[PDB]
Amino acid sequence: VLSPADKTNVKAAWGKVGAHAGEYGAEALERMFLSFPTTKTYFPHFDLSHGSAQVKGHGKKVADALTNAVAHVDDMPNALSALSDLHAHKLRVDPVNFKLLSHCLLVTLAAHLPAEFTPAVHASLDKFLASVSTVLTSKYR
Amino acid sequence: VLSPADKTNVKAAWGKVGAHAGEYGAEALERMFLSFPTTKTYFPHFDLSHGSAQVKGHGKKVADALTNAVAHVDDMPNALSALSDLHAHKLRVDPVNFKLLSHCLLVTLAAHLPAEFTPAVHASLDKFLASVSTVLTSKYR
Amino acid sequence: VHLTPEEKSAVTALWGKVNVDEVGGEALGRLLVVYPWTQRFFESFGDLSTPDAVMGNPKVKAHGKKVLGAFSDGLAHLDNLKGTFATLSELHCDKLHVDPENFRLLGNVLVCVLAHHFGKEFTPPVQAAYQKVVAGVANALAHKYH
Amino acid sequence: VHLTPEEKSAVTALWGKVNVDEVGGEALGRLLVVYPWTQRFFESFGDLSTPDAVMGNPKVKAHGKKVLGAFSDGLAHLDNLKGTFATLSELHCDKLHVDPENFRLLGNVLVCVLAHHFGKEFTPPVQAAYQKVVAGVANALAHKYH
Ligand code: HEM
Ligand code: HEM
Ligand code: HEM
Ligand code: HEM
């Protein structure tokens, strides 16, 4: 449950991401595919090589959904409704993998926001990715 | 989210459990300590030998809390509020261990309720134990 | 893995009582019912829309039998699951794309199934031994993922 | 664990630049902030009530340095993490009663801290190599639990 401080922390951090959001989403995916190779089983139809347009493109979609979640942080279930339907009924990604991408996103933000990534901000971001993860897996069963 | 059909399934199975709830609670604990020895790190102050009064006593407490949550399945947050504060602020059990006790309670029920443990009820009970686990871990951060 | 001889003899003894085909069908179908996202690999199989449809689907029963027969044959090589399952690991990664978390989910449903089938004979110590076996199998099947 | 020589050299190079005392205090502090239930083990340590109190707590810094020091020593025996950490494994089980899930959390926080500290130098491949190492170390420390 996101406290007002957590919300402030997340809007601030994601704010400084701004326009690089897409580039950071791709890097987070690349980090995930190299560190946790089991995650590649959901992308047999992609070229996962370094610099792949497919990964970059997917990264930009992931990032834009997170941008949408930050804008609607008081009403995430409705904002992300179609994406929870999508993952629940079509993609059917095992819920364990959400934690793996969330860690990779945190790593990416850490690597790019040397000053904003304070202990308190780290805590709020991890809570926020967990809440996104919970919504996206809400309709699985 | 527990569907109404899930709630009917949990009520019916736990109804059968009836008066054995505490004996079943202790057996699930003993299953957990033997199958997943890391969980014993939270009970260094207990005699964990088979049939100890401390384990039987704790089994009954676990079972009454579950009985309280089945009674108030539509309002579990309010119903377990005291227990979520206790686990979040005092006991501080890592969330991963809720999955292990849930598995062992499901195993115990399966072993004792041959007629009622159908696929659909198994599904409903797993989902119920996941929701209890989520409410008990709610206030951790 | 590492089972004590007492543990090994307990696994072996109960398994001698198992109808591999029936338990196979039951465990695969309950996998698909309790954790419906596992249905993702199986849409070639027809009607999976309700519990009854899943449990009664002959393709599901056939797959279950094939998965559990390999499992059974692995119980004879508890000393070397990784070698026993190395080619199946490769296959499930490179060609079938199965996230190895499904092996763990299956192993926990298998345990519930044995418990339901054997009731009080499935004691805490026997459960513990089977937990080790099912985690060992899952590990062995995941070992060649890359 | 098994590292390719280019993962081994990635891990070795970065680690020669790490101030163990400073990174250790940061990693431990962040664990206690981001996952506050881990404070369960440290109530002898003082004031842990706000992020600034945890990060500036001197007992957190001191212990942080002790833990990453032992962690350092294991990078020197990457081929036999189990034998290097057997004694400490037994201590954290029998005397300290620490759930080994905490080893995993600190591994991931340490990766966060390395990324924060080294920026773009902590590339995806370097991360991958460090993830194998911290998983290895966690595993090594959990090996003697019973
Ligand atoms: C923060 C969590 C995540 C977010 C916000 C997210 C968001 C999205 C979005 C926006 C799409 C595109 C939907 C469309 O086509 O309209 C998508 C597709 C997809 N996602 Fe997720 N997702 C997340 C986690 C994951 C994880 C953890 C996995 C697997 C490890 C995964 C696997 C996929 C796959 C396989 C697709 C389809 C890709 C394609 O075929 O183009 N997702 N995701
Ligand atoms: C289904 C989820 C669980 C339920 C419903 C539950 C319920 C309870 C209840 C009713 C108490 C007694 C509180 C009182 O005295 O007022 C308690 C205490 C405790 N629980 Fe939880 N519990 C659950 C999961 C866990 C897990 C997973 C662990 C650790 C592996 C755990 C460890 C403890 C410990 C250490 C105590 C203190 C016992 C003592 O000092 O006597 N609990 N729990
Ligand atoms: C005890 C665990 C497992 C064992 C021993 C096992 C074993 C096998 C075997 C022996 C085959 C046939 C290989 C061949 O064609 O040569 C197979 C195929 C397959 N398995 Fe696994 N499996 C296991 C778990 C799983 C799980 C959990 C799933 C997914 C939910 C899965 C999905 C598949 C798929 C989709 C195929 C292809 C079936 C076909 O093409 O008809 N397996 N497995
Ligand atoms: C990277 C993995 C870790 C290593 C290498 C490590 C190593 C050590 C060492 C060197 C000591 C001193 C033992 C002695 O004086 O004989 C120690 C103590 C201790 N560690 Fe661990 N540790 C690790 C992770 C953890 C984690 C994550 C926790 C819990 C969150 C933890 C909790 C403790 C506690 C409670 C002590 C006792 C401190 C005191 O005496 O008050 N350690 N550890």
**DSSP calls for B31-95:** HHHHH-GGGGGG-TTS--STT-HHHHHHHHHHHHHHHHHHHTGGGHHHHTHHHHHHIIIII---T
Nearest ligand atom owner, CA of A33 = 1
Experimental method: X-ray
Q: Which residues of C fall below an 8 Å CB-CB distance to A?
A: 34-40, 93, 97-102, 105, 142, 145-146
Residue of A1, A24, A35, A101 best to disrupt the D interface, most CBs of D under 10 A: A35
How many angstroms does the Cα of residue A129 sit away from the middle of ligand 2?
27
Reported as type and span, the H/E element at residue B9 is helix B4-17
Instruction: Write out the two tokens for A103.
Output: 């860690």
Which amino acid, residue C98?
Answer: V
Q: Which residues of B fall below an 8 Å CB-CB distance to D?
A: 37-39, 41-42, 44, 88, 92-94, 96-97, 140-141
Report how far residue B83's alpha carbon sits from residue B66's, in angstroms, rounded to the nearest whole number: 11
Which amino acid, residue A17?
Answer: V
Q: Nearest Cα to C54, choosing from C114, C109, C107, C118? A: C109
Candidates D37, D39, D54, D66: which one to mutate for ligand 4, based on the most atoms within 8 Å of Cβ? D66
Q: Taking a C-beta distance cutoff of 8 angstroms, is the pair D68, D59 a contact? A: no
Calculated CA dihedral for residues C109, C114, C117, C122, nearest 10 degrees? -130
Nearest ligand atom owner, CA of A105 = 1
Report how far residue B30's alpha carbon sits from residue C118's, in angstroms, rounded to the nearest whole number: 18
Using CA of residue D92, residue D98, residue D102, residue D104, what is the dihedral sign?
Answer: positive
How many of the other CB atoms lie within 10 Å of CB of B4? 9
Query: Which residues in chain C touch residue A41, judged by CB atoms under 8 angstroms apart?
Result: 93, 97-99, 145
How many angstroms does the Cα of residue B54 sit away from the middle of ligand 4?
29
End-to-end Cα spacing for chain C: 22
Q: Where are the alpha helices (DSSP H) in C16-123?
A: 20-34, 51-56, 58-74, 81-90, 101-118
DSSP letters for A5-69: HHHHHHHHHHHHHGGGHHHHHHHHHHHHHHH-GGGGGG-TTS--STT-HHHHHHHHHHHHHHHHH
Nearest to B141 among A127, A138, A141 (CB): A127
Q: Nearest Cα to C81, choosing from C70, C95, C92, C91? A: C70
Reported as type and span, the H/E element at residue A128 is helix A119-137
Domain containing residue D103: CATH number: 1.10.490.10
Interface touch B36/C131, C-beta < 8 Å: yes
Candidates A76, A81, A93: which one to mutate for ligand 1, based on the most atoms within 8 Å of Cβ? A93
Radius of gyration of chain C (CA): 15
Q: Taking a C-beta distance cutoff of 8 angstroms, is the pair A125, A106 a contact? A: yes
Q: Taking a C-beta distance cutoff of 8 angstroms, is the pair B65, B80 a contact? A: yes
Instruction: Write out the two tokens for C110.
Output: 């298998």
> Which distant-in-sequence residues (6+ apart) come within 8 Å of B113 by Cβ?
B13, B16, B17
Question: Measured from the CB, is residue D66 less than 6 Å from ligand 4?
Answer: yes
Structure letter (DSSP) for residue C50: S
> Which distant-in-sequence residues (6+ apart) come within 8 Å of C22 by Cβ?
none
Q: Can you say how many angstroms the Cα of residue C107 is from the centroid of all Cα atoms in its chain? A: 5
Residue of D48, D101, D102, D105 best to disrupt the B interface, most CBs of B under 10 A: D101
Task: Using the CB atoms, write b or e for A82-117: b if 16+ within 10 Å.
Answer: ebbeebbeeebbbebbbebbbbbbbbbbbbbbeebb
How many of the other CB atoms lie within 10 Å of CB of D30? 25
Please report how many Cα atoms fall inside a 13 Å half-sphere around the Cα of residue B68, on the Cβ side: 15
> Which distant-in-sequence residues (6+ apart) come within 8 Å of A78 by Cβ?
A72
Report how far residue D54's alpha carbon sits from residue D29's, in angstroms, rounded to the nearest whole number: 6
> Which distant-in-sequence residues (6+ apart) come within 8 Å of B84 by Cβ?
B77, B135, B136, B137, B138, B139
SS3 call for C106? helix
> Which distant-in-sequence residues (6+ apart) come within 8 Å of D58 by Cβ?
D46
Q: Nearest Cα to C54, choosing from C32, C35, C73? A: C32
Q: Taking a C-beta distance cutoff of 8 angstroms, is the pair C115, B110 a contact? A: yes
Annotated ligand binding at A112? The verdict is no
Query: Which residue, judged by its Cα, is nearest atom 12 of ligand 1?
Result: A61
Q: Taking a C-beta distance cutoff of 8 angstroms, is the pair D26, D57 a contact? A: no
Q: Nearest Cα to C101, choosing from C125, C74, C135? A: C135
Question: Measured from the CB, is residue A120 less than 6 Å from ligand 1?
Answer: no
How many of the other CB atoms lie within 10 Å of CB of C116? 21
Please report how many Cα atoms fall inside a 13 Å half-sphere around the Cα of residue C16, on the Cβ side: 6
Q: Nearest Cα to B121, choosing from B18, B19, B6? A: B6
Residue pairs between chains B and C whose CB atoms are closer than 8 Å: 56
Query: Which residue is closest to A3 within chain B, CA to CA?
Result: B141
Q: Nearest Cα to C99, choosing from A102, A36, A104, D105? A: A36
The breaks in chain D (C to N more than 2.5 Å) occur after none
Report how far residue B107's alpha carbon sits from residue C111's, in angstroms, rounded to the nearest whole number: 7
End-to-end Cα spacing for chain D: 22
Q: Do chains B and D touch (3 or more CB pairs under 8 A)?
A: yes
- Report the domain count for chain D: 1
> Chains with ≥3 Cβ pairs under 8 A against A?
B, C, D
Instruction: Write out the two tokens for D10.
Output: 């990635």
Distance (Å) of CA A25 to CA A121, A129, A140, D10, D31? 19, 13, 24, 24, 25
Quick one: three-class SS letters along A61-125?
HHHHHHHHHHHCHHHHHHHCHHHHHHHHHHHCCCCHHHHHHHHHHHHHHHHHCCCCCCHHHHHHH
Nearest to A92 among C34, C37, C93 (CB): C37
Nearest ligand atom owner, CA of C108 = 3
Question: Measured from the CB, is residue D38 less than 6 Å from ligand 4?
Answer: yes
Which amino acid, residue B68?
Answer: N
Question: Measured from the CB, is residue D137 less than 6 Å from ligand 4?
Answer: yes
Report how far residue D41's alpha carbon sits from residue D97's, in angstroms, rounded to the nearest whole number: 9
With tokens 């062992």, the residue in question is B104
Residue pairs between chains A and B whose CB atoms are closer than 8 Å: 7
Distance (Å) of CA C20 to CA A24, C31, C70? 49, 16, 10
Please report how many Cα atoms fall inside a 13 Å half-sphere around the Cα of residue A93, on the Cβ side: 24
Q: Nearest Cα to B25, choosing from B52, B62, B53? A: B62
How many angstroms does the Cα of residue D103 sit away from the middle of ligand 4?
10
Structure letter (DSSP) for residue A1: -
Residues in chain A: 141
Instruction: Write out the two tokens for C144.
Output: 């060649």
Q: CATH number of A1-141: 3.10.28.10, 1.10.490.10, 3.40.710.10, 1.10.10.60? A: 1.10.490.10
Using CA of residue C34, residue C39, residue C42, residue C44, what is the dihedral sign?
Answer: positive
Report how far residue D146's alpha carbon sits from residue C55's, in angstroms, rounded to the nearest whole number: 39
Interface touch C34/B112, C-beta < 8 Å: no
Q: Specify the ligand 4 atom closest to the Cα of D40.
A: 30
Quick one: three-class SS letters along chain D?
CCCCHHHHHHHHHHHCCCCHHHHHHHHHHHHHHHCHHHHHHCHHHCCCCCHHHHHHCHHHHHHHHHHHHHHHHHHCCCCCHHHHHHHHHHHHHHHCCCCCHHHHHHHHHHHHHHHHHHHHHCCHHHHHHHHHHHHHHHHHHHCCCC
Nearest to D98 among B39, B41, B93 (CB): B41
Backbone angles phi, psi at B48, to 5 degrees: -95, 25
Using CA of residue A139, residue A140, residue B1, residue B6, what is the dihedral sign?
Answer: positive
Q: Nearest Cα to D14, choosing from D141, D137, D138, D119? A: D119
SS3 call for B123? helix
* B61/chain C closest Cα distance in angstroms: 20
Report how far residue B127's alpha carbon sits from residue A48's, in angstroms, rounded to the nearest whole number: 35
